[PDB]
């Protein structure tokens, strides 16, 4: 019986489901969105897969008699897919190399650190607005607005252009065959929004990251083409805040349900950085990441046939007991080195410095401002986003004063 990634087994106590699969076959056939695929749940296997470049990240490449379909582009018209997939994460070397090197020249640690004061101020202002007591949805009031405001400032997106794309991005995070048309339509809205944003930045340059990317170049890697610039801007906008929203929300939930863990962090401030790493290891937002077998590729003693769609379960790998002992225990003091929540290999997250900064500042500020913060509902009643693309929490009631 081939597992169906659409079943509740993968959205209800799903890490137990992953453990059962890993135990039987760390690399096994599955069904998803009406197509055959291979799910990799073992840590060694997942790391090997992400390191094997025969497993391509480019959905635009064409192969004779093959119709390449990445689950994440469900409902996307071809031109829209291209707008979404002409960037680092959707490119293979040598294209990937050139794009990443050019973007790395401007998306630096220096630029990220320069934003630290802004992240702190935005965080402070959002917390100032929730009051001192009562129940509030910490996602709508904090976890979601902080990252979205930060990415907008990083990319030169004016205030008048912010309270809208969040809704489209949300529809895109879920992959429901029933809403394939609406998903494709939300995608087109994001494209149109980015096209107007780039147009505005080209005519009115600033000191933001997008303005800089419009000018970036180098003798060897040349520069970003119009299509590359637009697509990179699009992914930087979406990935630039959604993963962070998931981190802050999941992090808040985990600390609220692990009193011992929270106490330790509050006790020793130097322990916060690793707490964020453990939060990402425990429940990775990018639960699975997709690859396409350009050639036959053997992983874990299993021959993945050419043209196969491979779903590397980053999250499942993080709970492989062979790599992370007592994997189901959330321990902010554990050695988290090696987790795959930021990827592995040439596509390793470019936003890691900003993600860690946002998580550290956000959680430190939230739990520091509200010492009696408690969950507004039973832990078992929290609703987890039904998505293998980006796991997270969209609504989380909390009691500001316990
Ligand atoms: C907690 C938050 C974050 C997590 C968990 C995360 C996770 C990841 C993962 C798993 C990958 C590799 C994907 C693959 O192998 O196909 C990745 C790639 C990347 N991330 Fe993040 N990310 C986060 C935040 C950010 C932020 C804030 C930005 C931008 C502002 C960002 C920009 C990117 C880019 C551009 C890549 C593509 C790199 C490449 O393909 O060479 N990430 N991220
Ligand atoms: C709809 C499909 C796309 O998803 C998204 O952009 C999601 C909103 C983001 O949260 C994803 C999950 C990121 O966080 C990173 C893991 C990967 C990202 C940087 C890529 O480059 C990747 C090609 C990506 O754009 C697509 C999978």
Coil vs helix vs strand at 290: strand
Ligand 2 atom having least distance to the Cα of 172: 1
Contacts of 311 by beta carbon, 8 Å cutoff, 6+ apart:
5, 30, 32, 37, 38, 39, 40, 71, 288, 289, 290, 291, 388
Determine contact, residues 251/265, Cβ cutoff 8 Å.
no
Determine contact, residues 174/385, Cβ cutoff 8 Å.
yes
Report which protein residue has its CA nearest ligand 1's atom 30: 240
Determine contact, residues 22/56, Cβ cutoff 8 Å.
no
Separation of CA 129 and ligand 2 centre (Å):
31
Indicate the class that CATH gives domain 1-402: mainly alpha
Sign of CA dihedral 257, 260, 266, 270: negative
Report which protein residue has its CA nearest ligand 2's atom 16: 286
Determine contact, residues 46/40, Cβ cutoff 8 Å.
yes
Q: What is the DSSP string of 323-373?
A: TSSSTTS--TTS--TT--TT-SSTT--S-HHHHHHHHHHHHHHHHHH-TT-
DSSP letter, residue 383: P
Rg for the chain, CA atoms, rounded: 21
Coil vs helix vs strand at 275: helix
Q: Which of 2, 3, 11, 9 is nearest to 382 (CA)?
A: 11
d(CA 110, CA 327): 35
Q: Which of 215, 107, 103, 104 is nearest to 151 (CA)?
A: 107
d(CA 22, CA 40): 8
Provide the pairing of β-strand 35-40 with 309-312.
parallel
Angle at 213 between CA 193 and CA 60, to 5 degrees: 65
CA distances from 345 to 103, 191, 235, 308, 367 (A): 17, 29, 19, 20, 34
d(CA 133, CA 376): 12
d(CA 91, CA 231): 11
d(CA 72, CA 59): 10
Residue positions counted in the chain: 402
Determine contact, residues 49/68, Cβ cutoff 8 Å.
no
Determine contact, residues 329/278, Cβ cutoff 8 Å.
no
Q: Hey, what are 310's tokens? A: 């491979």
Question: Which segments of 28-144 does DSSP mark as H helices, in order?
Answer: 43-51, 78-84, 95-104, 109-114, 116-128, 138
Domain boundaries, the chain: 1-402
Angle at 107 between CA 101 and CA 113, to 5 degrees: 145
Pocket-testing residue among 90, 238, 291, ligand 2, by greatest number of atoms within 8 A of Cβ: 238
d(CA 56, CA 292): 5
From the CA of 90, the nearest ligand is 2
Determine contact, residues 214/201, Cβ cutoff 8 Å.
yes
Report which protein residue has its CA nearest ligand 1's atom 34: 350
* Pocket lining for ligand 2, CB < 6 angstroms: 72, 87, 89-90, 172, 235, 238-239, 242-243, 286, 389-390
d(CA 232, CA 84): 8
Phi, psi (rounded to 5 degrees) for 358 = -60, -45
Q: Which of 349, 386, 334, 285 is nearest to 103 (CA)?
A: 349
Ligand 1 atom having least distance to the Cα of 88: 40
Separation of CA 238 and ligand 2 centre (Å):
7
Coil vs helix vs strand at 35: strand
Coil vs helix vs strand at 55: strand
Cα dihedral angle (372, 377, 379, 380), rounded to 10 degrees? 170
Place of tokens 């970036």: 216
Determine contact, residues 360/278, Cβ cutoff 8 Å.
no
Place of tokens 């309270």: 163
Place of tokens 């507004």: 376
State which H helix or E strand residue 119 sits in.
helix 116-128
Contacts of 42 by beta carbon, 8 Å cutoff, 6+ apart:
22, 26, 27, 300, 316, 317, 320, 322
Q: Is 349 annotated as a binding residue?
A: yes
Q: Is 339 exposed, middle or buried (0-12, 13-18, 19+ CB in 10 A)?
A: buried
Contacts of 45 by beta carbon, 8 Å cutoff, 6+ apart:
26, 27, 299, 300, 317
Determine contact, residues 293/54, Cβ cutoff 8 Å.
yes
d(CA 47, CA 369): 39
Coil vs helix vs strand at 180: helix
DSSP letter, residue 150: H
Q: Which of 141, 154, 127, 130 is nearest to 238 (CA)?
A: 154
For residue 67, count other CB atoms closer than 10 A to its CB: 8
Cα dihedral angle (201, 202, 206, 209), rounded to 10 degrees? 70
Known catalytic membership, residue 358: yes
Determine contact, residues 18/315, Cβ cutoff 8 Å.
yes
Q: Hey, what are 340's tokens? A: 């795959």
Phi, psi (rounded to 5 degrees) for 279 = -65, -40
């Amino acid at each position: 019986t081939v597992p169906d990634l659409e079943s509740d087994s993968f959205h209800v106590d799903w890490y137990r489901t992953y453990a059962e699969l890993r135990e039987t076959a760390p690399v096994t056939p599955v069904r998803f969105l009406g197509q055959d695929a291979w799910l990799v749940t073992g840590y060694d296997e997942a790391k090997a897969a992400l390191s094997d470049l025969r497993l391509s990240s480019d959905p635009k490449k064409k192969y004779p008699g093959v119709e390449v379909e990445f689950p994440a582009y469900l409902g996307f018209p071809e031109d829209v897919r291209n707008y979404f997939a002409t960037n680092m994460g959707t490119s293979d070397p040598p294209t990937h190399t050139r794009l990443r090197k050019l973007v790395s020249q401007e998306f630096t640690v220096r630029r990220v650190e320069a934003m630290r004061p802004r992240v702190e101020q935005i965080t402070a202002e959002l917390l100032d607005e929730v009051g001192d007591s009562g129940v509030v949805d910490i996602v709508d009031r904090f976890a979601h607005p902080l990252p979205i405001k930060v990415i907008c400032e990083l990319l030169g997106v004016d205030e008048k252009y912010r309270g809208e794309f969040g809704r489209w991005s949300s529809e895109i995070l879920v992959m429901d065959p029933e809403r394939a048309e609406q998903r494709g339509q939300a995608a087109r809205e994001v494209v149109n929004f980015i096209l107007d944003l780039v147009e505005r930045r080209r005519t009115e340059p600033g000191d933001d990251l997008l303005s800089a990317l419009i000018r970036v170049q180098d003798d060897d890697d040349g520069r970003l083409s119009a299509d590359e610039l637009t697509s990179i801007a699009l992914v930087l906008l979406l990935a630039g805040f959604e993963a962070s929203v998931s981190l802050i929300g999941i992090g808040t939930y985990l600390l609220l349900t692990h009193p011992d863990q929270l106490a330790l962090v509050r006790r020793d401030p130097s322990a916060l950085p690793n707490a964020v790493e453990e939060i990402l290891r425990y429940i990775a937002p990018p639960e699975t990441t997709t690859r396409f077998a350009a050639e036959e590729v053997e992983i874990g003693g299993v021959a993945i046939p050419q043209y196969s769609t491979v779903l590397v379960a980053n999250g499942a790998a993080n709970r492989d007991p062979k790599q992370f002992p007592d994997p189901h225990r959330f321990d902010v003091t554990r050695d988290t080195r090696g987790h795959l929540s930021f990827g592995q290999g040439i596509h390793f997250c470019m936003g890691r410095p900003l993600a860690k900064l946002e998580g550290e500042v956000a959680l430190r500020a939230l739990f520091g401002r509200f010492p009696a913060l408690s969950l507004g509902i039973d832990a078992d009643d929290v609703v987890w986003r039904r998505s293998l693309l980006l796991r997270g929490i969209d609504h989380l009631p909390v009691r500001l004063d316990g």
